């Protein structure tokens, strides 16, 4: 279907604009793998980064990324829970807000859209967890099956 093709190609451009890697496009769009490369080469100057999908949980418990990931996810959680928008749409709308918050702090974007999309799929597969902080009360990311009652967020006690 031509309409079916038009929306998918349009979505691909949105993801390329957000810095999505090649594989992320292949997952959420029906476009051919080679077509994405030509599209990626047309939008951005160079060809796709040729790096493979990250999929590792050691990163998301690191001191600085845990902060950005726990912030991004708390925005994502609102999009699905009360925003009544799910799917790749929920992932993007949360990332847009995450980037928005970067402007104030002025720091560099620590969570790439690909890692952000990876984090969401990790939760969808129950490989990463949300633990509520005993001190502050905000819910951050932790390893699967990590114990509570001794949890303190990275911000309350670095």
């Amino acid at each position: 279907s031509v309409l079916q093709d038009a929306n998918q190609t349009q979505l691909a451009i949105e993801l390329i604009g957000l810095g999505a890697r090649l594989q992320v496009l292949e997952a959420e769009t029906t476009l051919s793998r080679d077509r994405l490369i030509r599209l990626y080469k047309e939008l951005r100057g160079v060809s796709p980064p040729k790096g493979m999908l990250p999929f590792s949980t050691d990163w998301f418990t690191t001191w600085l990324p845990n902060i950005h990931s726990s912030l991004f996810f708390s925005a994502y959680q609102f999009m699905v829970q009360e925003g009544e928008t799910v799917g790749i749409r929920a992932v993007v709308a949360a990332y847009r807000l995450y980037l928005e918050h970067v402007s104030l702090l002025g720091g560099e974007i620590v969570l790439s859209f690909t890692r952000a999309w990876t984090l969401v799929r990790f939760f969808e597969s129950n490989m990463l967890q949300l633990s509520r902080c005993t001190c502050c009360g905000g819910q951050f990311v932790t390893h699967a099956y990590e114990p509570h009652a001794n949890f303190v967020c990275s911000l309350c006690r670095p």
């Binding site: 708390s74 925005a75 959680q77 104030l104 702090l105 951050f140 911000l155």
Partner: protein, 94 residues
């Protein structure tokens, strides 16, 4: 009293103007920032100019503070303090 009611009436209107602008621009994104339900946000987009003015000069602070924990607030205002506040407010209910 007296002059204070001008500042109260001015602030009440200024909040309402931001709420409509946010909801009109994007409903879901607005609900996130204002921490407000879909029903209320939908109401704000449909509010007319005169309806806003009436609520503005109510002589009461129509908006309420979103922080109720002094222990968290005091530690919050002492370099990631800005980031930390967002994570707390995001989980707060509508």
């Amino acid at each position: 009293s007296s002059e204070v009611l001008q500042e109260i009436r001015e602030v009440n209107l200024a909040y309402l103007l931001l709420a409509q602008r946010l909801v009109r621009e994007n409903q879901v994104e607005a609900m996130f920032r204002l921490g407000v339900s879909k029903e209320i946000a939908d109401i704000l987009a449909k509010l007319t100019s005169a309806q806003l003015v009436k609520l503005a000069a109510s002589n009461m602070v129509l908006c309420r503070f979103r922080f109720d924990d002094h222990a968290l607030l005091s530690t919050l205002t002492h370099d990631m303090q800005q980031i930390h506040a967002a994570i707390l407010l995001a989980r707060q209910p509508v």
